[model samples]
Structure formats: C-alpha cells, structure tokens
Target: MGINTRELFLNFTIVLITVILMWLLVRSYQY
Candidate 1:
C-alpha cells in the first residue's frame, strides 16, 4: 500500500493558488 503525499501536496498548492487568484480577480472587479 503506497500513500501518495506527493499528489496531495501538489493539489493543495494548486488549490491555494487558485483561490488566491480568484480573490484577486474579485478584488479587481470590485474596484
């Protein structure tokens, strides 16, 4: 049984970046 932390961390980072970028877009739109 192999646990893949590599994939977990990769997805975590991508989701983090996505949320940050999404926030930026909303902020820009609000202004």
Candidate 2:
C-alpha cells in the first residue's frame, strides 16, 4: 500500500500543537 494522507495529517497536527505551545511560552520575551 502507498502512504496515506490520514497519517500525514496526524503527524502535522502534532507538530502544529507543539509549535503553538512554544510560541505561547516565548511571548514573555517579546522575541
């Protein structure tokens, strides 16, 4: 079978959430 979009979407979501949290944490520094 070939790679599926469903799996790729899930992985992308994980990274999106992670980046969002780090951005929020960095807000205090005004960077």
Candidate 3:
C-alpha cells in the first residue's frame, strides 16, 4: 500500500478552509 503525503495535505487544507469559512459566516449571521 502507498500513501501520498502531498495529496493528503492538500485535502486537509481544503477541508480546513471550508470549515473555517462556514463557521465564520454562521457566527456573523448571529449578530
């Protein structure tokens, strides 16, 4: 079995960015 580190990091970054943006938008809506 082989794991690609670069691809893994890219996926993680995408997910992290998506979650952060979503959280920020939701929080701002509460104001």
Candidate 4:
C-alpha cells in the first residue's frame, strides 16, 4: 500500500476507537 493509504487507515482506526468509546459510555449510562 502507499503511504497515504497507510495514513488514512491509521486515522480511521483512531476515529473508530473514539466512536466505540463513546458508545460504551452511553451504554453504561443507560444501564
């Protein structure tokens, strides 16, 4: 893969993790 593709993948992973963390926080509050 190219450098740009790798950078994009890394950025996507960070965003994905943030989304998962937000979901977990909301779920915990709902419980």
The best candidate by lDDT is 1
Question: What is the TM-score of each predicted model, taking all chains together?
Answer: 0.47, 0.44, 0.46, 0.44
C-alpha RMSD by candidate, in order: 4.6, 5.0, 4.9, 4.7
In model 3, state the lDDT of residue 31.
19
Worst 10 residues of 1 by lDDT: 1-10
Q: What digit string (tens of lDDT, one per residue) describes model 3 on residues 1-31?
A: 2765565766799788778878885677531
Q: Candidate 2 lDDT, tens digit per residue, 1-31?
A: 2865576766799788768867885677432
* TM-score of candidate 4 against the unseen true structure: 0.44
Error of 3 at 1 (Å): 9.4
- Candidate lDDT scores, in order, read 0.71, 0.70, 0.70, 0.70
Per-residue lDDT of candidate 1, residues 1-31 (tens digit): 2775565766799888778778885677542
For model 4, what is the alpha-carbon lDDT of residue 16? 88
Per-residue lDDT of model 4, residues 1-31, tens digit only:
5545455766799888778778885677542
Off by over 4 Å in 2: 1-5, 25-31
Ranked by lDDT from best down, the candidates are 1, 2, 3, 4
- For model 2, give the RMSD to the true fold: 5.0
* CA error at residue 1 for candidate 1, angstroms: 8.1
